[PDB]
Symmetry: C3
Subunit: 88 residues, 3 copies
Amino acid sequence: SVQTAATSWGTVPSIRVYTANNGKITERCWDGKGWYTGAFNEPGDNVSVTSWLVGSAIHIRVYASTGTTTTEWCWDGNGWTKGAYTAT
Amino acid sequence: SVQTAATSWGTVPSIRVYTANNGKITERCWDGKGWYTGAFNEPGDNVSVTSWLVGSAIHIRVYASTGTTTTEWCWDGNGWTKGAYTAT
Amino acid sequence: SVQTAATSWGTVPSIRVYTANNGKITERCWDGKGWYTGAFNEPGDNVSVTSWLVGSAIHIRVYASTGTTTTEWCWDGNGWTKGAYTAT
Ligand SMILES: OC[C@@]1(O)OC[C@@H](O)[C@@H](O)[C@@H]1O
Ligand SMILES: OC[C@@]1(O)OC[C@@H](O)[C@@H](O)[C@@H]1O
Ligand SMILES: OC[C@@]1(O)OC[C@@H](O)[C@@H](O)[C@@H]1O
Ligand SMILES: OC[C@@]1(O)OC[C@@H](O)[C@@H](O)[C@@H]1O
Ligand SMILES: OC[C@@]1(O)OC[C@@H](O)[C@@H](O)[C@@H]1O
Ligand SMILES: OC[C@@]1(O)OC[C@@H](O)[C@@H](O)[C@@H]1O
């Protein structure tokens, strides 16, 4: 089936749910006023996520896997880019 | 194999582990004095979870997926019910 | 594909990413100065993780599943050992 990963922050809260569906990962977002589709859209069959809130900044790391390749995607306030993570 | 998701809160801590096994999701709970089976029991092939502790209240969101359908289940102090989450 | 689980703590942050790949779970670690391979290496087809930071101590629980058997692995400052978790 589709596979999901979820994270949340604050007291509202903000929630992000990532779904790997048919080789594509998309993102659904809740910030207290309805669910909406987020900017994250990248290939993957499996997804995990962690996040940490520091001051006014949310930092999100999404680990997207296809086959034996895992790509880390980073949100640090200014869009998603690939991070330095490697599997070995 | 079976697939799990885990969350924890406080300093004891309380831990919740959700297992998707043969199309059913069940819940195991630790609050510092032994593991026990929790109230959550719903269909699903895949599970993720996030939680946030505010004051004296734990809020838990469990994302249960079967095929391409994901159902959000909500704990806000008074049993589990379906939440407003949709995949699109 | 390979399946991952991730957790993080503090403001650096420290990040741990567990990958179930071909029946084996390994661990990649970030503490602010490069990714490296951690001590955790145990069998499993699926992995989840949760952690909680108390004072100067990180506590990590990794749930490793093979077939219908899930083993909890515990980090409490002194290496990884099996925990009391059972699926029922
Ligand atoms: O629109 C909300 C948003 O900016 O929040 C932070 C990240 O989750 C982004 O992908 C997302 O688009
Ligand atoms: O700022 C991005 C970055 O340094 O954040 C910490 C880790 O997620 C790294 O892999 C990543 O490149
Ligand atoms: O009994 C403990 C319990 O109430 O804790 C909160 C939720 O995890 C419930 O499913 C669970 O039954
Ligand atoms: O109180 C329940 C609720 O509003 O909590 C926030 C989100 O999880 C929503 O999907 C959900 O319906
Ligand atoms: O070397 C860093 C380390 O000790 O951090 C705590 C755990 O993640 C361990 O598996 C890991 O080896
Ligand atoms: O100190 C280890 C332990 O007691 O921690 C809490 C739970 O993870 C238990 O299953 C585990 O045996």
